[PDB]
Structures are given as structure tokens and as C-alpha cells.
Design a protein around this ligand. Structure first.
Ligand SMILES: Nc1nc2c(ncn2[C@H]2C[C@H](O)[C@@H](COP(=O)(O)OP(=O)(O)OP(=O)(O)O)O2)c(=O)[nH]1
Ligand SMILES: [Mg+2]
Lengths: 553, 406
DNA sequence: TCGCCCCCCTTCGGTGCTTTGCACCGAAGGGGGGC
């Protein structure tokens, strides 16, 4: 049945007209599936015949359903969507089972053909013109237009979600004691009422939906656990993800590996410790989805580790609002982090991972800060509050970081947890110069046209060095000059540069970098005992910097 | 009453900014506030066929523990026509920064008695999110002059003049300046005396529909040079790089006879005695930094820019300029709550204070260059915001070379 | 041979700097999952 809800006015983008795209060929089985739907759609008032006055057209096809025997109708509105007005999408996110509370009575309902029960603005309908082919030349196609929301049109999801919200709003206001998760046409309905009253409220909800033309077939009406919902399985006390089958291949293509990494990210919401860094590295620098990529040894190990984790059975629990949320993070190496969110020990609400490389140069403390931020935002989305943190970093380490780093930074209430490897600063620059330590005046210069440069130093102990450099840049030569001072100095050194750039990188205490040269400098800094690093303006005649800048000529 | 025709600037379209996540208590407050505003016809429920959106959140001051809805119309305001171009802007009075106490009043509710151009309402849409995305977002648009839209003080300008006339009539030496939804009201009366006439202005306003600032204490902090009795090579290198930087700000400052006290490849900790020709150069340079710069004047046709640096132990230095190195004002903001633990809270409060000073001094807020990662700021800043306005800002990562301002 | 949403990983291209590459950032490609 078509809703007596009022149509939402919709327009094309200014200046544009409608689509005009000829129909293509389809199989015998799909044309009769569509003809069954189409003449039934016409008799249910979902579509109407048109003719040649309407000059628009758009091709149509069909795909089969997870329900093995039903067919899904789709019209290729790619062109009409481009010319259709923008919408502000009302689906802001995806509900998560870890955000659910325990309920005594639970129901999952689905509205059938919800799109086809929502009417389409009458002035817009003529732009949805299409044509059903029936083989090749036996006839030209019959022409229809949509009277309801079509599958494949840009605005159909938003107009269904908005209409569903309007229809449900009376019933939500009347029953605040009943939680209704509303995803597209899928309704999760939980209550603390005994099953008798609960089922009264369901039939009441169903009758309210049907007055507005939304049918709810018993085929899609779950009343017993485990409920299938949003890809999960809802038990009374716990939830599981529906089974995750990983690809297993002798030969791997780029596209195979992309599928694998996606499955593992999805698994990581409840399977603790998933890693995808080595498998994802195999996608770098590739140039075709069908290009065969051999697994490195590191990626095999990572895959095997994930496979061990995924054969263990896991479950999440539900949210108890009268207890704190606790978030614990572990370091996995190579910029990878994993976390669990729980309220009572060894009963995770969910898990996750953070593994993004932000910036060319960074350190573990920054990345831990980023993990905390990802977790804080996720907890706001799911539970409306941030959790208490348990972090493998000492209070001394953090305090040393936010007092010697020039940007404002913070972490909310957190408790140290001793789960090695701990997050630590891998070196610290001295705030004052070091008595008795050598003083290096470093400098490097390159020529823009040349690819050519020099890096070198002078020393208060009389030491000097210059090395030629090829295919370099101005900034590289300065990093190189610092590289050699660290290379040729003892455990304690004083260094003076005129590169704001280099001082900028090194003062932020990075422990990893996308640049191999910066990585080499980091290794040298970690091996040192004390390092004071000072800056002076270039080309101003300053002793030390003067002589080395002369020398690099 | 009939509406004023409003348009966006030529070639620009309405705002399209996504709603960010909100805590449970902020979502509840917005649902309570918007449900009542919809009943009173100030806003109307809309659907997704309106393609525009502006983020909404809520703030709660602790000397008024009721939630205040705040819509971030910064994008919409940038795209709205100027009212200085069509004869409606509010002139700023030079006398306000002279007053010894200035109280800020939130008068945003007065705008809700004037309707908004029917064809402009669509640009004001916002969306309330849902915990764990239980439902789609819920959308509204304004039917009246919104709080936080720069067109509301301009359209309401005629009316607020008539409402205020008797008060300014009876108090010729109290200065009142309207900035957005705020009245900045300053006087020279004693602390509790001033608070009393604030309450009188409040009641006259009710007839139809924060804490004390002190501008005569907004000390300017200049570039200072250290004073020691023994000077290292590193000390004089630190000194010379600082003066070389200040030679782009001040006039006639030299380093020639400090620069070659450092002649030779010297050790960073070797003490170098100061020549009489060096003490001559240094005590000279310190007096130039003593009293400030000649030729620096405010230009109302150009934007204000603010830079902030974290110094440590709760201290934050700042500079306000329109042209690089021609600072209208330099200052230092100091700690408050006493733990001094939270950098993001301190920076957020520093921004409110610096922007407040700009409003009182020049009548508008500066664009801020914030020494913080974008995602760190966005994770936490709304938890500490207490103003009904929001300045423009951007995120910079500039390491210090000198500590010029310390 | 379709639509809308969230997530992650990689690649690309626009912006601004007292630059000449570099670092940052948003958008778009691929993948997962939902209806
Ligand atoms: N355009 C498009 N929409 C889909 C697709 N899958 C699901 N949906 C949309 C259209 C459907 O009306 C709605 C829900 O689909 P469902 O599989 O839950 O049921 P459907 O309406 O297709 O038929 P049914 O409820 O089983 O009678 O979301 C798809 O592949 N393409
Ligand atoms: Mg359906």
C-alpha cells in the first residue's frame, strides 16, 4: 500500500533538464521477473504508463536477493542523480550493538518494500521515465514513470528515512519506555515490559505503521533470540558478529588483498589484536586491481596471527549506564595500536584499532594521543560520554612531553597500566648547553638547478668536514649536516644550525618518519647521551656559523 | 511586521557543514530547547530536501547553570551579504576600552521577535544527532532572526536603539556596544555600584524582551632582554637571533658589535666578557623595546589576526596584528583554575579572553592562528567554550626559534 | 551496468610559506559492513 503521507517537494539542479538514456539488453529471466513486478507495481499504483510526450528515459535492470528466490528491481539513474538537487542526508552514522542496553523483551521488525510505499513528488515523476525491453526486437519497450521512491535514485534513502521518522514520532512520544532503533526499514524494538504487554505494543506499532501504508510481514518479524540485526547476533546477555570468512588463496591479487584488509577491519570491532599494516603495505605502489602481488614474509606472519585470533570465539556485552566506561590501549609496533572498551574486567563491549600515519614525522606519544582522540569520539557516538583511560605510558613521560612540546596537548583522566611495551620518549634535547661537550657548527646548502649540494661542519675543538651531495634539496643538505655532526661526535654534543626547518622537525622529538634520512637521524639521537641543539640566523656573520657557511662554499 | 530582503554574496551558496558528535547531556538540552522553540514558532521542522546545514552544540556557564544553544553560523556569516554595504552595521565606540568595568549581557533572545526573510530561512538549517544513531538526525530551520547570525544585530539595529535610548539617556557616561548577541556595557563606578546599574539595564530589557571585565588591567607585554652579570657564547647567540628577529618590527636595532664578540669557532659555554661597545649596543636596544613602535594604526577595513604561543607553567603570549610585524597589541595570558594541567582548556580560555579584548577595543574578533593540532582542538574545545560568539581560526605548527615573547 | 550511510588504507592534488620543496589536508580511488 502507498502511504497517504504527503510528498516531499524535490527539484532538479538549476539549469538542468531530465535524463535521456536508451535501454540495454537483459536476460529472459530478468525481463519476466521485472514484468511480474512491473504489472504488479502498476496495479498497486507504484508506476504508471507514459508515452512519447515525456521525452526522458533511463535504463533498468534487476539483481537477485539474499532471500534466494526474490528479485530486486533497480533503474540506472546515474544521470538523473547528477542533475537532481543535493540533499542533506539524515543518516548520521551506524548504530552499534555495544550501545544497546539489556532489555527484557526484544523484537526486530522490517517494513517490506518501504521505498515503494512512499509517494514521489508529482511534478518530479516525469523525470523517472524508463522502458522495459522484453528481449531484443520482439517489441519496443513499454514506458513507465515512478509514482513512489525508486531504488537507485539519489533522494530515495533520505525521503524514506525522513518519512519513517515522521510516522514513528507519534508512537515514540506515546511510548518513551520503548527504544526503537530505526535503520532504513529495519526496526529494533526493546522494552522492559513483560512479553504480554510488549507484544501488545508491537501489534499497536504494526497497526500504526499499516495505517500509514507500511506493511510488516511475519517473514521479517523476529521474536526470539538470537535476533539478526545490522550484521550481528543479539543474545539476551551478549552479542556476536555474523561469521567472517576470510579469503584463502594460493595466488593473491591487489583486489584480493583489499578485500582481506576490509574483512579484518570489520573483525577488529570485537576481535582484539587484529593487525593489517604488513598486508596493507602490499597495496602500496601497485597499479592494477588484477596485478598479482606475492605476500612478503611479514604479511604471511601477520595473516597467520589474525587467523589464530579469528578462530577463537568472541562476544561483546551490552551497555550498563550505571557503570563507568573504561578504555585500555596497547602498543603493537610500527605505529599500530589496539584497544578494548569495557565496564567490568574481561567483558568487552567492543574493541578496535588505530594505525593511521599522520604527518611525515611523528612519535609514539603523538600517536597515542591520536588513538585516545579516536576512542573519545567513538565513545561519544555510541554512548554519549567519554571513557576513563588506562594507558601504557608513565605520568613522568607524559609530563615531560607536554612541558617540552610547544603545541597545546592533553589527555583526559587516565591511569597508568604496565603492559609492555610502554610508550616512551626515545630521547630528550637538553634545555641548556652541555659543559665539556664538543660544539658543532653545522650547515648545508644545495643549488636548485643543479641537484648538487654540500653538508659539513666546524668545531670548537678544531674539527671540520665537508661531503658532496648529489640529487638533493636545500632542506636535505641541512638534515645531512646535522646527520654528520651526530655521526662524528661523542655521546654528548652541542649543535648549532641555521635551519628553522631542521630544528622544527628534531625539536618535536620524532621516533619514526617516512623519510629514511630523518629515520637515520632519529637512530643517532637515540644512541646519544645528551644533545643540546641551537639555532642562529644565517648569513649574519656569527662566529662558528660564519666559518662553516664559508666552508660549505 | 514585514521582513528585510536578505541575500547571500554573489556566486556563493548556503552552508553545508556536517554535524559533529554530541554528549548525552548536550543532545538532551538541544531537544528540550528546540522542542520549545518549535512550539513558539521560532523554528520549524524540515526534511532532507533542504540541502543546507550548520553544526549545533550547547554551552553551560557555571554562573548560570542552564544550557545555552549555540549554532556555529561562522560559514553562513561569511557568505551573508554585508550590511555595511546596505546601511545597517553597528558603529563601535572608542570609549568602551576606557571604562574600568565592562559587563557582558546575552541579549540574543530579543531577535526572536522579528521574522526572517522567507527565502533566506533555508540557509539556517541544523541537525540534532542521536546517541548510537538510534534515529536519523532531526532538522530545523529558523523562522526568526537567529542567534549567532551576523544579520540579526543589523536588522534589529533600529529596535535596540529605541529600547536602549532611556537608559543611555539617564546614564550618559555608561557606554553600551552591541556585538552579535552581546551587549558590552562599561562604566567607571565602584565594583558593586556598577553591578547594580547592570541589574537595572537587565530589568528595562525584560520590560520588552557574565563576569566583570577590567580593561585598565590588560597590561601589554613587550619584548624583554635577559639581565645577567656573566654572559656565555650561547647567551649572546640567543641574544643576537632575538634582536635580528625584532629588526623586522622595530627601527634601528643593530647586532654588528654583538655579532663579532663571537668571532671564531667558540665553545657554547665559554663566558665572553662584554665590551664597552657591546654594553653600548645592548642597553640601547633594550630602551627601544622599552617603549613601543611608531606608525602602527588600526585599519577597520582589514581583518584582525591573533597569534598565540604556549610558554609553560600556565603562561600564554599573544600578538594582534593586521599586517605582519606591525602589532596593534602584544600580551600575555595567565592561568586560572589552579591545577594548570589542561593545555586545551587554557588555550580555549585564552582565545575567549583575547577575542573579548578585540571586541571591546576594536569592535570585532580576530582570526586566530592556534598552536595546536586540528584534531586535538576539535576533540575538546566545546567543553570549555562560554561565549555566544565563535571567532574564525586556523591551525599552525610553528616551532619556536627564539622565545621572543619570553 | 543502482541508491544513501559509517569505518580503514592509499593516492593525488590544491594551498601557503617572508618556499623553489615541503608539510598539511580534503577528496577520491579501493576495500569492509548496514538497509
Ligand atoms: N537502491 C538500493 N536499495 C537497497 C538495496 N538493498 C537494500 N536497499 C534499500 C531498498 C529497500 O527498499 C530497503 C530495504 O531493503 P530490504 O532488503 O530490507 O527489503 P526490500 O524493500 O528490498 O524488499 P522486502 O522488504 O523483502 O519485501 O533499502 C540495494 O542494493 N540497492
Ligand atoms: Mg523494505
Amino acid at each position: 500500500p502507498i502511504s497517504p503521507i504527503e510528498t516531499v517537494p524535490v527539484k532538479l539542479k538549476p539549469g538542468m533538464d531530465g535524463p535521456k538514456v536508451k535501454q540495454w539488453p537483459l536476460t529472459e529471466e530478468k525481463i519476466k521477473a521485472l514484468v511480474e513486478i512491473c504489472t504488479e507495481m502498476e496495479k498497486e499504483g507504484k508506476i504508471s504508463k507514459i508515452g512519447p510526450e515525456n521525452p526522458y528515459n533511463t535504463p533498468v535492470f534487476a539483481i537477485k536477493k539474499k532471500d534466494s528466490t526474490k528479485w530486486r528491481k533497480l533503474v540506472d539513474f546515474r544521470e538523473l542523480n547528477k542533475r537532481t538537487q543535493d540533499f542533506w542526508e539524515v543518516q548520521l552514522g551506524i548504530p552499534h550493538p555495544a550501545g544497546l542496553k539489556q532489555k527484557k523483551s526484544v523484537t526486530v521488525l522490517d517494513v517490506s518494500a518501504a521505498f515503494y510505499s512512499v509517494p514521489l513528488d508529482k511534478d518530479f515523476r516525469k523525470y523517472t521515465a524508463f522502458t522495459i525491453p522484453s528481449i531484443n526486437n520482439e517489441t519496443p519497450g513499454i514506458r513507465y514513470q515512478y509514482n513512489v521512491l525508486p531504488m537507485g535514485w539519489k533522494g530515495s534513502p533520505a525521503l524514506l528515512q525522513s518519512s519513517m521518522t515522521k510516522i514513528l514520532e507519534p508512537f515514540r512520544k506515546q511510548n518513551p519506555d520503548i527504544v526503537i532503533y530505526q535503520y532504513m526499514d529495519d526496526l529494533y524494538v526493546g522494552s522492559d515490559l513483560e512479553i504480554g504487554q510488549h507484544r501488545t505494543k508491537i501489534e499497536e506499532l504494526r497497526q500504526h505503521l499499516l495505517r500509514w501504508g507500511f506493511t510488516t510481514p511475519d517473514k521479517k518479524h523476529q521474536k526470539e533470540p538470537p535476533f539478526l540485526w545490522m550484521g550481528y547476533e543479539l543474545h539476551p546477555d551478549k552479542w556476536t558478529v555474523q561469521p567472517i570468512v576470510l579469503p584463502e588463496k594460493d595466488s593473491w591479487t591487489v583486489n584480493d588483498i583489499q578485500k582481506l584488509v576490509g574483512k579484518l577491519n570489520w573483525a577488529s570491532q570485537i576481535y582484539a589484536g587484529i593487525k593489517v599494516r604488513q598486508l596493507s603495505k602490499l597495496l602500496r605502489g601497485t597499479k592494477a586491481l588484477t596485478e598479482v602481488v606475492p605476500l612478503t614474509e611479514e604479511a604471511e606472519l601477520e595473516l597467520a596471527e589474525n587467523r589464530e585470533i579469528l578462530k577463537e570465539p568472541v562476544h561483546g556485552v551490552y551497555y550498563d549506564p550505571s557503570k563507568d566506561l573504561i578504555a585500555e590501549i596497547q602498543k603493537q609496533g610500527q605505529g599500530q595500536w589496539t584497544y578494548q572498551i569495557y565496564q567490568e574486567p574481561f567483558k568487552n563491549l567492543k574493541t578496535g584499532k588505530y594505525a593511521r600515519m599522520k604527518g611525515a614525522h611523528t612519535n609514539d606519544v603523538k600517536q597515542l594521543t591520536e588513538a585516545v582522540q579516536k576512542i573519545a569520539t567513538e565513545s561519544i557516538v555510541i554512548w554519549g560520554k567519554t571513557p576513563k583511560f588506562k594507558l601504557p605510558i608513565q605520568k613522568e613521560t607524559w609530563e615531560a612531553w607536554w612541558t617540552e612540546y610547544w603545541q597545546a596537548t592533553w589527555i583526559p583522566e587516565w591511569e597508568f597500566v604496565n603492559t609492555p611495551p610502554l610508550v616512551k620518549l626515545w630521547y630528550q634535547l637538553e634545555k641548556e648547553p652541555i659543559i665539556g661537550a664538543e660544539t658543532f657548527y653545522v650547515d648545508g646548502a644545495a643549488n636548485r638547478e643543479t641537484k648538487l649540494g654540500k653538508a659539513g661542519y666546524v668545531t670548537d675543538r678544531g674539527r671540520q668536514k665537508v661531503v658532496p651531495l648529489t640529487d638533493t634539496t636545500n632542506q636535505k643538505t641541512e638534515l645531512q649536516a646535522i646527520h654528520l655532526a651526530l655521526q662524528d661526535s661523542g655521546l654528548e654534543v652541542n649543535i648549532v644550525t641555521d635551519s628553522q626547518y631542521a630544528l622544527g622537525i628534531i625539536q618535536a622529538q620524532p621516533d619514526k618518519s617516512e623519510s629514511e634520512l630523518v629515520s637515520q637521524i632519529i637512530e643517532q639521537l637515540i644512541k646519544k647521551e645528551k644533545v643540546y641543539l641551537a639555532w642562529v640566523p644565517a648569513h649574519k656573520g656569527i662566529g662558528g656559523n660564519e666559518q662553516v657557511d664559508k666552508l660549505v662554499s | 511586521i514585514e521582513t528585510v530582503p536578505v541575500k547571500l554574496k554573489p556566486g556563493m551558496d548556503g552552508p553545508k557543514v556536517k554535524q559533529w558528535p554530541l554528549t548525552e547531556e548536550k543532545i538532551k538540552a538541544l531537544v528540550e530547547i528546540c522542542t520549545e522553540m518549535e512550539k513558539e514558532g521560532k523554528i520549524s521542522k524540515i526534511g532532507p530536501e533542504n540541502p543546507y546545514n550548520t553544526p549545533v552544540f550547547a554551552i553551560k556557564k557555571k554562573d548560570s547553570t542552564k544550557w545555552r544553544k549555540l549554532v556555529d553560523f561562522r560559514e553562513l556569516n561569511k557568505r551573508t551579504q554585508d550590511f555595511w554595504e546596505v546601511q545597517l552595521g553597528i558603529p563601535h565606540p572608542a570609549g568602551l576600552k576606557q571604562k574600568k568595568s565592562v559587563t557582558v549581557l546575552d541579549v540574543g533572545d530579543a531577535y526572536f521577535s522579528v521574522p526572517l526573510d522567507k527565502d533566506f530561512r533555508k540557509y539556517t538549517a541544523f541537525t540534532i544527532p542521536s546517541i548510537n544513531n538510534e534515529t536519523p538526525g532531526i532538522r530545523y530551520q529558523y523562522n526568526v532572526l537567529p542567534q549567532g547570525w551576523k544579520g540579526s544585530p543589523a536588522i534589529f539595529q533600529s529596535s535596540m536603539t529605541k529600547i536602549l535610548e532611556p537608559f543611555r539617556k539617564q546614564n550618559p557616561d555608561i557606554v553600551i556596544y552591541q556585538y552579535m548577541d552581546d551587549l558590552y556595557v562599561g562604566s567607571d563606578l565602584e565594583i558593586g555600584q556598577h553591578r547594580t546599574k547592570i541589574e537595572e539595564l537587565r530589568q528595562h530589557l525584560l520590560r520588552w524582551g557574565g563576569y566583570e571585565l577590567h580593561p585598565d588591567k590588560w597590561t601589554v607585554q613587550p619584548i624583554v632582554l635577559p639581565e645577567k652579570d656573566s654572559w656565555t657564547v650561547n647567551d649572546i647567540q640567543k641574544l643576537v637571533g632575538k634582536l635580528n628577529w625584532a629588526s623586522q618590527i622595530y627601527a634601528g636595532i643593530k647586532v654588528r658589535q654583538l655579532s663579532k664578540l663571537l668571532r671564531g669557532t667558540k665553545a657554547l659555554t665559554e663566558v665572553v666578557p662584554l665590551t664597552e661597545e657591546a654594553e653600548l649596543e645592548l642597553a640601547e636596544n633594550r630602551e627601544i623595546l622599552k617603549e613601543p613602535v611608531h606608525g602602527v594604526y588600526y585599519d577597520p577595513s582589514k581583518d584582525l589576526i591573533a597569534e598565540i604561543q604556549k610558554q609553560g607553567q600556565g603562561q600564554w603570549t599573544y600578538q594582534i596584528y593586521q599586517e605582519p610585524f606591525k602589532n596593534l597589541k602584544t600580551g600575555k595570558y595567565a592561568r586560572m583554575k589552579g591545577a594548570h594541567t589542561n593545555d586545551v582548556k587554557q588555550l580555549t580560555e585564552a582565545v575567549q579572553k583575547i577575542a573579548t579584548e578585540s571586541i571591546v577595543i576594536w569592535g570585532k574578533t580576530p582570526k586566530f592562528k592556534l598552536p595546536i593540532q586540528k584534531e586535538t582542538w576539535e576533540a575538546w574545545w566545546t567543553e570549555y567554550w562560554q561565549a555566544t560568539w565563535i571567532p574564525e581560526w586556523e591551525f599552525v605548527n610553528t616551532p619556536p626559534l627564539v622565545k621572543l615573547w619570553y
